[PDB]
Design a protein around this nucleic acid. Structure first.
Ligand SMILES: C[C@@H]1C[C@@H]([C@H](O)CC2CC(=O)NC(=O)C2)C(=O)[C@@H](C)C1
Ligand SMILES: [K+]
Ligand SMILES: [K+]
Ligand SMILES: [K+]
Ligand SMILES: [K+]
Ligand SMILES: [K+]
Ligand SMILES: [K+]
Ligand SMILES: [K+]
Ligand SMILES: [K+]
Ligand SMILES: [K+]
Ligand SMILES: [K+]
Ligand SMILES: [K+]
Ligand SMILES: [K+]
Ligand SMILES: [K+]
Ligand SMILES: [K+]
Ligand SMILES: [K+]
Ligand SMILES: [K+]
Ligand SMILES: [Mg+2]
Ligand SMILES: [Mg+2]
Ligand SMILES: [Mg+2]
Ligand SMILES: [Mg+2]
Ligand SMILES: [Mg+2]
Ligand SMILES: [Mg+2]
Ligand SMILES: [Mg+2]
Ligand SMILES: [Mg+2]
Ligand SMILES: [Mg+2]
Ligand SMILES: [Mg+2]
Ligand SMILES: [Mg+2]
Ligand SMILES: [Mg+2]
Ligand SMILES: [Mg+2]
Ligand SMILES: [Mg+2]
Ligand SMILES: [Mg+2]
Ligand SMILES: [Mg+2]
Ligand SMILES: [Mg+2]
Ligand SMILES: [Mg+2]
Ligand SMILES: [Mg+2]
Ligand SMILES: [Mg+2]
Ligand SMILES: [Mg+2]
Ligand SMILES: [Mg+2]
Ligand SMILES: [Mg+2]
Ligand SMILES: [Mg+2]
Ligand SMILES: [Mg+2]
Ligand SMILES: [Mg+2]
Ligand SMILES: [Mg+2]
Ligand SMILES: [Mg+2]
Ligand SMILES: [Mg+2]
Ligand SMILES: [Mg+2]
Ligand SMILES: [Mg+2]
Ligand SMILES: [Mg+2]
Lengths: 51, 185
RNA sequence: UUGGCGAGAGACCGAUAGCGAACAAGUACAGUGAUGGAAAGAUGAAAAGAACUUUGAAAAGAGAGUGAAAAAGUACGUGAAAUUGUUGAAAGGGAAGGGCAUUUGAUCAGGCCAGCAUCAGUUUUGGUGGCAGGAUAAAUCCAUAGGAAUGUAGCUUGCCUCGGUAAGUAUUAUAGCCUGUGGGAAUACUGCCAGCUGGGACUGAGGACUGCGACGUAAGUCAAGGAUGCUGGCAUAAUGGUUAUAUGCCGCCCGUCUUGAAACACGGACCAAGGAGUCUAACGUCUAUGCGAGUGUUUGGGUGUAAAACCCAUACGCGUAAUGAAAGUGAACGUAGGUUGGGGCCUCGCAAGAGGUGCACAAUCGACCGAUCCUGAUGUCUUCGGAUGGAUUUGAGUAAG
RNA sequence: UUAGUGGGCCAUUUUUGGUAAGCAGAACUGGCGAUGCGGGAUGAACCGAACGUAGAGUUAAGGUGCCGGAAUACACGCUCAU
RNA sequence: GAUGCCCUGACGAGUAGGCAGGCGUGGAGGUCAGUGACGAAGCCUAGACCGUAAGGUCGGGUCGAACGGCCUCUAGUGCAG
RNA sequence: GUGUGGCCUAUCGAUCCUUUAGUCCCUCGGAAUUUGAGGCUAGAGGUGCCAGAAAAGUUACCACAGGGAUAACUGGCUUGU
RNA sequence: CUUUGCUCCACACAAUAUAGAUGGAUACGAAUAAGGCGUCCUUGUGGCGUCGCUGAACCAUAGCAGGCUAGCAACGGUGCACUUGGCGGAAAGGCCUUGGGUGCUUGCUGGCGAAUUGCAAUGUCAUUUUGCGUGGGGAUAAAUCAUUUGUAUACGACUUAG
């Protein structure tokens, strides 16, 4: 009789999507990426700054 | 606004009820609406639609047409069903046994079926015997045999009959109907 | 047999109708004449049609009276509208009228008006948290190499209101800056979160249960298939209706022909009443109904409770055969054909399907009947007969009505 | 099976006659005619958008000194006209 | 009340024109053993109610003899020109 | 092989009537024969307003239905002159 | 000069109806590539200092919509009525000032009251206009018609006289 929006109504969220409980619990919306120390080639930078 | 691809509020263009005010036909329709909804049988949906048809779409079925149908292989003991009137035909001599279900029998048709050992039944008696259309054979009379259809599509080279009251030598056989008088058709 | 005489009737008209004429109507009246030709019905049961008094020259008024009623007085049933008088109410700076909304006044019929909390649906406006990317921002910052000038210190000359300096010189010194290279961050910008919270507005359809979920060890509970809880005032003109007015904004005059009308296009001053797709003969499509290879009782006859209803023989009409100008001839090779589709039914399959049978209907190839053109057997009033077989020919045909 | 119609007109683009025309005549599309609504003061046809009755939100085209709902907003310039 | 009740989804501009469902008028068959001199019909009424509307209903005034609802039939059946 | 007129793209004509060719066939309805007439199939005689009436003017003496679908003023667009 | 009519003032009591009170319209002039305020002196188009960068100010502001009372400290603030003198004609109708009187004082410290309008409802506090009744004062006409004139004139109007 009445369309409830999952994005507002938390109960309806869980009805449609059982994973939402997990996603919220593990804070998958704010996952830290693993640090990497890659550096561009001279050529990449030399062309980027080229007049 | 909406850019409509189709015509809005378009009626289906099929009868959904008999135009007739015949009480008894309305009872038959109350029965077959029930069976068509509550069974899965294709037969009942077909019989229900046939009870809505106008007189011109329910042409009579002669008893010779019924007899011809029962000569089909594997068909001799099927209940023939005619949603309309079964008329007599004195062109046949030997009629088979068989059960015929129909809205109406002419006096002559009812005589001929019964004399051969057969049985004429109403469509409600059919319902009780054969609720899922079991072991039936639906027959339709010929539609395009009406006099009116001779005249549809009249035009040059179409080969249809002119609408004409009096026929004879002097009625529409000259200019336009032969090469000697202008041209043919 | 729309005249005359005498009768009986009606799904007819009801005084602008119905005959022109419901009435002293072919009258009054017009026209030299032929001719033309209206309007005009209704007091009350009964005149009981107002004696008498009074004002007035009188008409009349005012009383009184008659009557069920003079809101029936002959200017007579009812007594609309246009248009008018009086009274009452209201508004009014070059029209009036109208729409939406509310104020004010008047008027009027049958729970009314709100506040907070917790929810749900839709939405608006804030606060704040976590992440991702990019030159793994660029910068700033730190370190370091080099540089110069809008050249800092120092120095050298010249000015010396006696430090104000003007010009050289000098590249960090008693200011700093630029460029390059390293280093470590942060921030912006963009994006993501099934992150968290505050404020505001509109909505509350539905009406036992039934669903999908969530939370709980279960019991159960819940914000989960649409609002409940708690509280106040009033209980009547208070809300609301109506109406008049005021105010904001908006609003050209309808009808018509027209590409185009508010038009400096036409009709319309106003009001009542009347005022225009009808009936018939014969038809097309469609639909309903009866009966059905038939169908149609109603010309007529019989009968009758009398224009009704009821009953009916023989015909006749249309249909059941076509085709041809005509003389004429006249519809099964076959399971009334074959092929391709085809609803439904039948068989087998849990089902999908597969197979069988396939009416209506569609396309196509055949066959049959008539016309046309050929062919021309046996026969024979030797010119009739016309078998058989054909044809890019033709018909408003047959092929279980 | 049957109604109405068989005077059209406008805009963008292509296009003929003509000095040209709110002129005459064609092409394709969209419109007006038959259509209100927001905008263009006003207006058949332009822009936006097509319309059951209401409530809330958001916008189109066009706007935000005052008339008039909405910044006498922010920013870089240009312009002074007896 | 199955022409009923109900569930679900979508849609709604309109001249000429088409079709559908309704409202109203004179008269006819049937019915309500309908209303009425204790007031029928008509007329007046910035009084009330129902219907999107055609219209219907009620109160008050005036009035004086007839008139309505429903199911059908039928037309000389609806006016601003 | 080509040829059903002209290398291709134009060069032409209904109904009624008359007339010719063909079949020597059908009909003249009380029955025959022979003339005559009538039919059937294919042409010709022509309609150029070419889908095809048989057709001279005048009106300032004029009439009617209409037209701003259309001229004779103004006004409007245009501005060749 | 008799319906005791007219007027003003005070006070009630009615109505009236608001283009919209709800602490205060809080006074230089001039310039703006310049000023204001304070201060000093040779009084100037002077020297010195200081302010702005908005009224986000200043003033007022506590008490039953503001009650009833007791003290302290000042002799100040403020309201009302009454007086003194002055100034203001642009539309002055207001500004200032003297004097005494009488209240109030939240400058400071006490005592008593407030309830039930029930958990909000403008919750009524302003301002006009007019009438009406009481008491107190005050004043004691004209115009028009009709008549009349001709400097005037269609009629009104105008101008004259009684
Ligand atoms: C000029 C001449 C006559 C002409 C024709 O017959 C004229 C007829 C046409 C018609 O149908 N009805 C008439 O009354 C006149 C025709 O055929 C031409 C060849 C020869
Ligand atoms: K819509
Ligand atoms: K008459
Ligand atoms: K009367
Ligand atoms: K009101
Ligand atoms: K017209
Ligand atoms: K005219
Ligand atoms: K047509
Ligand atoms: K046509
Ligand atoms: K439009
Ligand atoms: K517009
Ligand atoms: K848009
Ligand atoms: K203005
Ligand atoms: K009746
Ligand atoms: K012609
Ligand atoms: K003539
Ligand atoms: K020119
Ligand atoms: Mg008459
Ligand atoms: Mg009476
Ligand atoms: Mg009368
Ligand atoms: Mg009147
Ligand atoms: Mg919410
Ligand atoms: Mg109200
Ligand atoms: Mg306007
Ligand atoms: Mg025109
Ligand atoms: Mg018009
Ligand atoms: Mg004009
Ligand atoms: Mg005209
Ligand atoms: Mg006129
Ligand atoms: Mg008239
Ligand atoms: Mg009328
Ligand atoms: Mg037509
Ligand atoms: Mg034409
Ligand atoms: Mg026309
Ligand atoms: Mg034109
Ligand atoms: Mg038109
Ligand atoms: Mg403009
Ligand atoms: Mg504004
Ligand atoms: Mg519509
Ligand atoms: Mg009648
Ligand atoms: Mg009455
Ligand atoms: Mg009235
Ligand atoms: Mg009477
Ligand atoms: Mg009529
Ligand atoms: Mg009228
Ligand atoms: Mg009209
Ligand atoms: Mg003869
Ligand atoms: Mg022609
Ligand atoms: Mg014109």
């Amino acid at each position: 009789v009445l369309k409830k929006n999952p994005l507002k109504n938390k109960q309806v969220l869980l009805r449609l999507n059982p994973y939402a409980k997990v996603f919220a619990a593990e804070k998958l919306g704010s996952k830290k990426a693993e640090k990497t120390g890659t550096k561009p080639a001279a050529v990449f930078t030399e062309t980027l700054k080229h007049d | 606004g909406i850019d409509h691809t189709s015509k809005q509020h378009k009626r289906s263009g099929h009868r959904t009820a008999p135009k007739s005010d015949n009480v008894y036909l309305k009872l038959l329709v109350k029965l077959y609406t029930f069976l068509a909804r509550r069974t899965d049988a294709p037969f009942n949906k077909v019989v229900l639609k046939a009870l809505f048809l106008s007189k011109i779409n329910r042409p009579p079925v002669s008893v010779s047409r019924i007899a011809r149908a029962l000569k089909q292989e594997g068909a001799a003991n099927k209940t023939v069903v005619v949603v309309g009137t079964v008329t007599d035909d004195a062109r046949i001599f030997e009629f088979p046994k068989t059960t015929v279900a129909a809205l109406r029998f002419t006096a002559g048709a009812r005589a001929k079926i019964v004399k051969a050992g057969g049985e004429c039944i109403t469509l409600d008696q059919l319902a009780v015997r054969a609720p899922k259309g079991q072991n039936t054979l639906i027959l339709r009379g010929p539609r395009n045999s009406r006099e009116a259809v001779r005249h549809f599509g009249m035009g040059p080279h179409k080969g249809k009959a002119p609408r004409i009251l009096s026929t004879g030598r002097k009625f529409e056989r000259a200019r336009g109907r032969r090469r000697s008088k202008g041209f043919k058709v």
